[PDB]
Amino acid sequence: GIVEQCCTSICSLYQLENYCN
Amino acid sequence: GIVEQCCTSICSLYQLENYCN
Amino acid sequence: VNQHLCGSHLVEALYLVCGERGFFP
Amino acid sequence: VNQHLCGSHLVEALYLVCGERGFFP
């Protein structure tokens, strides 16, 4: 989920934008 | 400068991207 | 610099990046 | 949520948004 992807690991702008809307 | 614009006030993604490159 | 985005910093970054019409978990 | 970007959080956000080929002050 977003926490493993962006908090535990580091995510790019494009990855972060996948969780939008 | 960027600190008045984004730290003192709140800046948008587009404003922040103006300071890139 | 710390590139990890956790907690309120993740929320803040989603709100910055997704903007208006924000985001979903 | 706090939308202001100061100090290391500003640096982190520039690095996130500008990416590769980062940024200028």
Domain region containing C18: 1-25
Nearest CA in chain C to D6: C9
Output the CA torsion sign for C7, C8, C9, C15: positive
Please tell me the total count of domains within chain C: 1
CA distance B4 to C1: 21
Asked if C20 reaches chain A (Cβ–Cβ under 8 Å), the answer is no
* Count of Cβ atoms closer than 10 Å to residue A21 Cβ: 9
Q: For residues B20 and D2, what is the distance between their CA atoms, to the nearest angstrom?
A: 22
Residue C23 and residue C5: Cα distance in Å, rounded? 15
Q: Which residues of chain D are within 8 Å of residue B16 when distances are taken between CB atoms?
A: 5, 13-14, 17
CA D7 to chain centre: 9
